[PDB]
Coordinates of C-alpha atoms and ligand atoms in Angstrom, one line a residue:
Chain A
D1 CA -21.7 9.6 -81.3
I2 CA -21.2 6.5 -79.2
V3 CA -24.4 5.6 -77.2
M4 CA -24.0 4.3 -73.8
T5 CA -27.2 2.4 -72.8
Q6 CA -28.2 1.6 -69.1
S7 CA -31.5 -0.2 -69.5
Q8 CA -32.5 -0.4 -65.9
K9 CA -33.2 3.2 -64.6
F10 CA -34.0 1.7 -61.1
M11 CA -32.6 -1.4 -59.4
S12 CA -33.8 -2.6 -55.9
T13 CA -31.5 -4.3 -53.4
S14 CA -31.1 -4.9 -49.6
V15 CA -28.2 -3.9 -47.4
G16 CA -25.6 -6.7 -47.5
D17 CA -26.7 -7.9 -51.0
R18 CA -24.9 -7.8 -54.3
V19 CA -26.3 -5.7 -57.2
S20 CA -24.9 -5.4 -60.8
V21 CA -25.5 -2.3 -62.9
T22 CA -25.3 -3.0 -66.7
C23 CA -24.2 -0.8 -69.5
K24 CA -23.9 -1.3 -73.2
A25 CA -21.9 0.7 -75.7
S26 CA -23.2 1.0 -79.2
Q27 CA -19.7 0.4 -80.6
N28 CA -16.5 -1.0 -79.4
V29 CA -14.8 1.1 -76.7
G30 CA -12.2 -1.2 -75.5
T31 CA -11.7 -0.7 -71.8
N32 CA -11.9 3.1 -71.9
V33 CA -14.9 3.1 -69.6
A34 CA -15.5 4.9 -66.3
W35 CA -18.2 4.6 -63.7
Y36 CA -19.5 7.4 -61.4
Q37 CA -21.6 7.8 -58.4
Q38 CA -24.0 10.8 -57.8
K39 CA -25.9 11.5 -54.6
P40 CA -28.6 14.2 -54.4
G41 CA -27.2 17.8 -54.3
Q42 CA -23.7 16.7 -55.0
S43 CA -21.2 16.5 -57.9
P44 CA -20.4 13.2 -59.5
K45 CA -17.6 11.1 -57.9
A46 CA -15.5 8.8 -60.1
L47 CA -15.5 5.0 -59.0
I48 CA -13.9 3.0 -61.8
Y49 CA -11.5 3.9 -64.6
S50 CA -10.3 1.7 -67.5
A51 CA -13.4 -0.4 -66.9
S52 CA -12.0 -2.3 -63.8
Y53 CA -9.5 0.0 -61.8
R54 CA -10.9 1.6 -58.6
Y55 CA -10.4 5.3 -58.0
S56 CA -8.5 6.3 -54.8
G57 CA -10.4 5.6 -51.7
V58 CA -13.3 3.8 -53.4
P59 CA -14.2 0.7 -51.3
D60 CA -13.3 -2.6 -52.7
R61 CA -17.0 -3.5 -52.5
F62 CA -17.1 -1.8 -55.9
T63 CA -16.0 -3.8 -58.8
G64 CA -16.0 -3.1 -62.6
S65 CA -15.6 -5.4 -65.5
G66 CA -16.1 -5.7 -69.3
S67 CA -14.4 -5.0 -72.6
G68 CA -15.7 -4.1 -75.9
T69 CA -19.4 -3.2 -75.5
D70 CA -20.8 -4.9 -72.3
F71 CA -19.8 -3.4 -69.0
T72 CA -20.8 -4.1 -65.4
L73 CA -20.5 -2.2 -62.1
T74 CA -20.9 -4.7 -59.3
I75 CA -21.6 -3.5 -55.8
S76 CA -21.1 -6.1 -53.1
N77 CA -22.2 -6.0 -49.5
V78 CA -24.5 -3.1 -50.4
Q79 CA -24.5 -0.3 -47.8
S80 CA -27.1 2.3 -47.1
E81 CA -24.7 5.0 -48.1
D82 CA -24.5 3.5 -51.6
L83 CA -27.9 5.0 -52.2
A84 CA -27.1 7.1 -55.4
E85 CA -27.4 7.3 -59.2
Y86 CA -24.7 5.3 -61.1
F87 CA -23.4 6.4 -64.5
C88 CA -21.2 4.7 -67.0
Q89 CA -19.3 6.6 -69.5
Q90 CA -16.9 5.9 -72.5
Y91 CA -13.9 8.3 -73.2
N92 CA -12.7 6.1 -76.2
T93 CA -13.9 8.5 -78.9
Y94 CA -15.1 12.1 -79.0
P95 CA -17.3 13.2 -77.8
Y96 CA -17.1 11.4 -74.4
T97 CA -20.6 10.1 -73.6
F98 CA -22.5 8.9 -70.5
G99 CA -25.2 6.3 -69.9
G100 CA -28.5 7.5 -68.8
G101 CA -28.0 6.6 -65.2
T102 CA -29.3 3.7 -62.9
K103 CA -30.7 4.6 -59.4
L104 CA -30.2 2.3 -56.6
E105 CA -33.1 1.9 -54.3
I106 CA -32.7 0.0 -50.9
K107 CA -35.5 -2.3 -49.4
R108 CA -35.9 -2.1 -45.7
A109 CA -38.5 -2.7 -43.0
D110 CA -41.7 -0.6 -42.7
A111 CA -41.3 2.6 -40.6
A112 CA -44.0 4.9 -39.4
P113 CA -43.7 8.6 -40.0
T114 CA -42.6 10.9 -37.2
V115 CA -45.0 14.0 -37.6
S116 CA -44.2 17.5 -36.4
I117 CA -46.2 20.6 -37.0
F118 CA -45.0 24.2 -36.7
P119 CA -47.0 27.6 -36.6
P120 CA -45.9 30.6 -38.7
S121 CA -43.0 32.4 -37.1
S122 CA -43.5 35.9 -35.8
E123 CA -40.8 36.8 -38.3
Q124 CA -42.9 35.7 -41.2
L125 CA -46.1 37.3 -39.7
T126 CA -44.5 40.7 -39.5
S127 CA -44.9 41.1 -43.3
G128 CA -48.4 39.7 -43.8
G129 CA -47.9 36.0 -44.7
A130 CA -48.3 32.8 -42.7
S131 CA -46.9 29.4 -43.5
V132 CA -47.7 26.3 -41.4
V133 CA -45.2 23.6 -41.8
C134 CA -45.6 19.8 -41.3
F135 CA -42.7 17.4 -41.5
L136 CA -43.5 13.7 -42.0
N137 CA -40.0 12.1 -41.4
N138 CA -38.2 8.8 -41.6
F139 CA -41.0 6.6 -43.0
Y140 CA -40.9 3.6 -45.3
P141 CA -42.3 2.7 -47.8
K142 CA -42.5 5.8 -49.8
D143 CA -46.3 6.0 -50.4
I144 CA -47.9 8.5 -48.1
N145 CA -50.7 11.0 -48.1
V146 CA -51.0 14.3 -46.2
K147 CA -54.3 16.2 -45.3
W148 CA -54.6 19.7 -43.8
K149 CA -57.6 20.7 -41.6
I150 CA -58.4 24.2 -40.4
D151 CA -60.9 24.3 -37.6
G152 CA -61.8 20.7 -38.5
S153 CA -62.3 21.5 -42.2
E154 CA -60.1 20.1 -45.0
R155 CA -57.9 22.7 -46.7
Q156 CA -56.5 21.9 -50.2
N157 CA -55.3 25.1 -51.8
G158 CA -52.1 26.7 -50.6
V159 CA -50.3 23.4 -49.9
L160 CA -46.9 22.6 -51.3
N161 CA -45.2 19.2 -50.8
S162 CA -41.6 18.2 -51.1
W163 CA -39.9 14.8 -50.7
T164 CA -36.4 13.6 -50.0
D165 CA -34.7 10.7 -51.7
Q166 CA -33.9 7.7 -49.4
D167 CA -31.8 8.6 -46.5
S168 CA -28.1 7.7 -46.7
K169 CA -28.1 6.3 -43.1
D170 CA -31.5 4.6 -42.5
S171 CA -32.9 4.2 -46.0
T172 CA -36.2 6.0 -45.1
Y173 CA -38.1 8.7 -46.8
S174 CA -39.2 12.1 -45.5
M175 CA -41.7 14.7 -46.7
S176 CA -42.3 18.4 -46.0
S177 CA -45.7 19.8 -46.4
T178 CA -46.3 23.7 -46.1
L179 CA -49.8 25.4 -46.0
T180 CA -49.3 29.0 -46.9
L181 CA -52.1 31.4 -45.9
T182 CA -52.3 35.2 -45.5
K183 CA -51.7 36.5 -41.9
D184 CA -55.4 37.7 -42.1
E185 CA -56.7 34.3 -43.0
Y186 CA -54.5 32.6 -40.4
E187 CA -55.8 34.9 -37.7
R188 CA -59.5 34.0 -38.5
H189 CA -59.1 30.3 -37.3
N190 CA -57.8 28.5 -34.3
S191 CA -57.1 24.7 -34.9
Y192 CA -54.5 23.7 -37.5
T193 CA -53.9 20.0 -38.1
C194 CA -51.8 18.0 -40.5
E195 CA -52.8 14.3 -40.9
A196 CA -50.6 11.6 -42.4
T197 CA -52.0 8.3 -43.8
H198 CA -49.4 5.6 -44.3
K199 CA -49.6 1.8 -44.4
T200 CA -48.1 1.5 -40.9
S201 CA -51.2 2.8 -39.3
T202 CA -54.9 2.1 -40.0
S203 CA -55.7 5.6 -38.6
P204 CA -54.2 8.9 -39.8
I205 CA -51.2 9.9 -37.8
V206 CA -52.0 13.5 -36.7
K207 CA -50.4 16.6 -35.2
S208 CA -52.2 19.9 -34.3
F209 CA -52.0 23.2 -32.6
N210 CA -54.4 25.8 -31.5
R211 CA -53.5 29.5 -32.2
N212 CA -55.2 30.1 -28.8
Chain B
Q1 CA -5.6 17.8 -51.8
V2 CA -7.1 20.0 -54.4
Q3 CA -10.0 22.5 -54.6
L4 CA -11.9 23.6 -57.8
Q5 CA -13.8 26.8 -56.8
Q6 CA -16.8 27.7 -59.1
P7 CA -19.4 30.3 -58.3
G8 CA -22.6 28.9 -56.9
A9 CA -25.0 30.6 -59.4
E10 CA -25.3 32.8 -62.5
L11 CA -28.6 34.6 -63.4
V12 CA -28.2 35.8 -67.0
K13 CA -30.9 37.2 -69.4
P14 CA -31.9 35.2 -72.6
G15 CA -29.5 36.2 -75.6
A16 CA -26.6 37.4 -73.3
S17 CA -23.4 35.5 -72.5
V18 CA -21.8 34.3 -69.4
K19 CA -18.2 33.2 -68.4
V20 CA -18.1 30.7 -65.6
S21 CA -14.8 30.5 -63.7
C22 CA -13.1 27.5 -62.0
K23 CA -10.3 28.5 -59.9
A24 CA -7.9 25.6 -59.0
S25 CA -5.5 25.1 -56.2
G26 CA -3.4 22.4 -54.7
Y27 CA -1.7 20.9 -57.8
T28 CA 0.3 22.1 -60.8
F29 CA -2.4 23.8 -62.9
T30 CA -0.6 23.5 -66.2
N31 CA -0.1 19.6 -66.1
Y32 CA -3.7 18.4 -66.2
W33 CA -6.7 18.5 -68.5
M34 CA -9.7 20.4 -67.1
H35 CA -13.0 18.9 -68.1
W36 CA -16.4 20.6 -68.3
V37 CA -19.8 18.8 -67.8
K38 CA -23.3 20.0 -68.0
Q39 CA -26.2 18.6 -66.1
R40 CA -29.9 19.6 -66.6
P41 CA -32.2 19.4 -63.5
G42 CA -33.1 15.9 -62.8
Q43 CA -31.4 14.7 -66.0
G44 CA -28.1 12.9 -67.0
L45 CA -24.5 14.2 -67.7
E46 CA -23.2 15.7 -70.8
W47 CA -19.5 16.2 -71.6
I48 CA -18.8 19.6 -73.1
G49 CA -15.1 19.3 -73.8
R50 CA -11.6 19.5 -72.1
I51 CA -8.7 22.0 -72.1
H52 CA -5.0 21.5 -71.3
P53 CA -3.7 24.6 -69.6
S54 CA -0.1 24.2 -70.9
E55 CA -1.0 25.5 -74.4
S56 CA -4.8 25.6 -74.4
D57 CA -5.1 22.6 -76.5
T58 CA -8.8 21.7 -76.5
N59 CA -11.2 18.9 -77.6
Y60 CA -14.8 19.9 -77.9
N61 CA -18.2 18.0 -78.1
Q62 CA -19.2 19.1 -81.5
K63 CA -22.7 19.8 -80.1
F64 CA -21.2 22.7 -78.1
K65 CA -19.1 24.3 -80.8
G66 CA -20.2 27.9 -81.3
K67 CA -21.9 27.8 -77.9
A68 CA -19.0 26.9 -75.3
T69 CA -15.6 28.4 -75.3
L70 CA -12.9 26.9 -73.0
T71 CA -9.9 29.2 -71.9
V72 CA -7.4 29.3 -69.1
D73 CA -5.3 31.9 -67.3
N74 CA -2.1 30.5 -66.0
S75 CA -1.2 33.5 -63.9
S76 CA -4.3 32.8 -61.7
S77 CA -4.6 29.1 -62.2
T78 CA -8.2 29.6 -63.4
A79 CA -10.1 27.8 -66.1
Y80 CA -13.1 29.5 -67.9
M81 CA -16.1 28.3 -69.8
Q82 CA -17.9 31.0 -71.9
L83 CA -21.5 30.4 -73.1
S84 CA -22.9 32.6 -75.9
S85 CA -26.4 33.5 -77.1
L86 CA -28.0 32.0 -73.9
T87 CA -31.4 30.2 -74.1
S88 CA -33.5 28.3 -71.6
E89 CA -31.9 25.2 -72.9
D90 CA -28.7 26.4 -71.5
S91 CA -30.1 26.5 -67.9
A92 CA -28.2 23.8 -66.1
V93 CA -25.5 23.0 -63.6
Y94 CA -21.9 23.2 -65.0
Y95 CA -19.0 21.3 -63.4
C96 CA -15.3 21.6 -63.9
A97 CA -13.2 18.6 -63.0
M98 CA -9.7 17.1 -63.2
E99 CA -7.9 14.1 -62.0
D100 CA -4.4 13.2 -61.0
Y101 CA -2.5 10.1 -59.9
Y102 CA -1.3 9.1 -56.4
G103 CA 0.0 5.7 -55.1
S104 CA -1.6 3.2 -57.6
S105 CA -4.9 5.0 -58.4
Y106 CA -6.4 8.1 -60.0
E107 CA -8.2 10.6 -57.7
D108 CA -10.8 13.0 -59.2
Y109 CA -11.8 16.4 -58.0
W110 CA -14.8 18.5 -58.9
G111 CA -16.0 21.9 -58.6
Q112 CA -19.2 22.4 -56.6
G113 CA -21.1 23.1 -59.9
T114 CA -22.4 26.6 -61.2
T115 CA -26.2 26.7 -61.4
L116 CA -26.8 28.8 -64.5
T117 CA -30.4 30.1 -64.8
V118 CA -31.3 31.9 -68.1
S119 CA -34.1 34.2 -67.2
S120 CA -35.1 37.9 -67.3
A121 CA -36.4 37.8 -63.7
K122 CA -34.5 39.5 -60.9
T123 CA -32.6 37.9 -58.1
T124 CA -34.6 37.7 -54.9
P125 CA -32.9 36.7 -51.7
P126 CA -34.7 34.2 -49.4
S127 CA -36.6 35.0 -46.2
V128 CA -35.4 32.5 -43.5
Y129 CA -37.9 31.6 -40.8
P130 CA -37.3 29.6 -37.7
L131 CA -39.5 26.6 -37.0
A132 CA -39.7 26.0 -33.3
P133 CA -42.3 23.6 -31.5
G134 CA -45.2 25.6 -30.2
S135 CA -45.8 25.4 -26.5
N136 CA -40.4 13.5 -25.7
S137 CA -37.0 11.9 -26.1
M138 CA -36.2 13.8 -29.5
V139 CA -37.2 17.1 -30.7
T140 CA -37.5 18.3 -34.3
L141 CA -36.6 21.9 -35.3
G142 CA -36.6 23.5 -38.7
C143 CA -35.9 26.3 -41.1
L144 CA -38.2 27.7 -43.8
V145 CA -36.4 29.2 -46.7
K146 CA -39.1 31.1 -48.5
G147 CA -39.4 33.2 -51.7
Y148 CA -36.0 33.1 -53.5
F149 CA -34.8 33.2 -57.1
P150 CA -32.9 31.6 -58.7
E151 CA -31.6 28.3 -57.6
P152 CA -29.6 27.2 -55.5
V153 CA -29.8 27.6 -51.8
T154 CA -27.6 25.5 -49.5
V155 CA -28.5 24.9 -45.8
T156 CA -26.3 23.8 -42.9
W157 CA -27.0 23.5 -39.2
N158 CA -24.4 24.9 -36.6
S159 CA -22.1 25.7 -39.4
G160 CA -22.0 22.1 -40.5
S161 CA -21.1 20.6 -37.1
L162 CA -24.7 19.3 -36.8
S163 CA -25.0 16.8 -39.7
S164 CA -26.9 13.8 -38.4
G165 CA -30.7 13.8 -38.3
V166 CA -31.0 16.6 -41.0
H167 CA -33.5 16.5 -43.7
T168 CA -33.2 19.2 -46.4
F169 CA -36.0 19.1 -48.9
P170 CA -35.8 19.9 -52.6
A171 CA -37.2 23.3 -53.4
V172 CA -40.5 23.9 -55.0
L173 CA -41.2 26.6 -57.6
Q174 CA -44.5 28.6 -57.2
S175 CA -45.4 32.0 -58.5
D176 CA -41.9 32.5 -60.0
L177 CA -40.3 31.9 -56.6
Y178 CA -38.6 29.0 -54.9
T179 CA -39.1 27.7 -51.3
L180 CA -37.6 25.0 -49.3
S181 CA -37.3 23.7 -45.8
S182 CA -34.8 21.9 -43.6
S183 CA -35.6 19.8 -40.5
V184 CA -33.2 18.7 -37.8
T185 CA -33.9 16.2 -35.0
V186 CA -31.8 16.3 -31.8
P187 CA -31.9 14.9 -28.2
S188 CA -34.3 16.8 -26.1
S189 CA -31.4 17.2 -23.6
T190 CA -29.3 19.2 -26.0
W191 CA -32.0 21.8 -27.1
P192 CA -32.9 24.4 -25.9
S193 CA -29.9 23.9 -23.5
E194 CA -27.4 24.1 -26.6
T195 CA -27.9 26.4 -29.4
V196 CA -29.3 25.2 -32.8
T197 CA -28.8 27.5 -35.8
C198 CA -29.6 27.1 -39.4
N199 CA -27.2 28.7 -41.9
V200 CA -28.7 29.5 -45.3
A201 CA -26.6 30.7 -48.3
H202 CA -28.2 32.0 -51.6
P203 CA -25.1 32.6 -53.8
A204 CA -27.0 34.4 -56.6
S205 CA -27.8 37.3 -54.1
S206 CA -24.5 36.8 -52.1
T207 CA -26.5 36.2 -48.9
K208 CA -25.5 34.1 -46.0
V209 CA -28.1 34.2 -43.2
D210 CA -28.0 32.6 -39.7
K211 CA -31.2 31.9 -37.9
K212 CA -31.1 30.8 -34.2
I213 CA -34.0 28.5 -33.3
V214 CA -35.3 29.8 -30.0
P215 CA -38.1 28.1 -28.0
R216 CA -41.6 29.7 -28.3
Ligands
7V7_1 C1 -16.3 13.5 -67.2 C2 -14.8 13.8 -67.4 C3 -14.0 12.6 -67.9 O1 -14.3 12.1 -68.9 N1 -13.1 12.2 -67.0 C4 -12.7 12.8 -65.7 C5 -13.4 12.4 -64.6 C6 -13.2 12.9 -63.4 C7 -12.1 13.9 -63.4 C8 -11.5 14.3 -64.5 C9 -11.7 13.7 -65.7 C10 -12.3 10.9 -67.5 C11 -12.2 9.9 -66.4 C12 -11.3 8.7 -66.8 N2 -10.1 9.1 -67.3 C13 -9.2 8.0 -67.6 C14 -7.7 8.4 -67.5 C15 -6.9 7.1 -68.1 C16 -6.4 7.0 -69.2 C17 -5.7 6.0 -69.7 C18 -5.4 4.9 -68.9 C19 -5.8 5.0 -67.5 C20 -6.5 6.2 -67.1 C21 -10.2 10.1 -68.4 C22 -10.9 11.3 -68.0

């Protein structure tokens, strides 16, 4: 089969700049090459066909070039909503084959996390479990740590963390941390705290509640 | 405009088979190739093959011969992909897709993707819990979607009319069950005064649940 190679799995740019994603075919595929965009949780969307023609409704900031084996997707005046994975593909010969993808990352200014903590709902407690949730939202850059304390003591087991990709509107990151306890364990303690450490503050950014 | 409707999920046991449907509307079904694509979680794209509904001409990726079978039913404008002898390597999202021409450009359409999970586990619907601030300019609310199987779940707020300021987190698998959460941030003048509701769909269990966030 024809191998399509994208040798930059990640490329970093800034809003308003120009970025070029490269793609190399192992053998001549003429101009029978397409480009696709894929954002998290979504199907792929075609950008370019015949190596240089834009699909309907695709902004003219997207341009394609190349013939033979070297192909380029160029994005001019990069917008925050261009945050996505980009795939090249040849349909010259069976089987049609895709490049490995290139993820676009957008540089922006530092942003401190907005922290919110939530107690277990009465709905969850009615069946014997108890999750405490902490959202650490809209921060930049991506590096961040979260620490849970129960009545002042650090709690490590029972914590599950999840992170979003960069937001399509403001290019920040967010994170969700969930501390799951039993209802019985939860009701033995009063103070519940989640602490974020991020480069935007030399102290932890903290949120708490008392079960009172 | 054109819709390709695929079921959200299929849970099938190892060794069995599955037939994924792609119901098309908005164009002449028998005029266009219908393509099928496989995508494994966090991985790239694989072309399975294509079928032309006129006479069911097919072109297959050789790697899927004996695994995938493409057919069509012109009476219902539906395309099908059958997968035999399922293994965990078959677990993936499967898309159908076509394109037609308008003005001076092609325009593509895709199904939402069918998440096939190959597993002997049972379906388990999620429990949906409201996240309200215990007793500022902006207020953050959320929805905890806990203990479901298999993937996916989709989350909206106010039936989709609340789309700014939402973060919906990837699920995490623990003790054979998935859990995810979604947060939404709104002006403090609009909530509690106006209602905020998370809508949670788990296609594998045919569940759609609404949870109103009411203040504590
Ligand atoms: C992954 C599936 C796939 O490979 N495709 C696709 C993508 C989206 C929706 C339907 C199918 C191809 C996209 C490019 N087209 C080119 C058409 C063409 C041919 C000759 C001259 C001008 C244009 C071929 C099919």
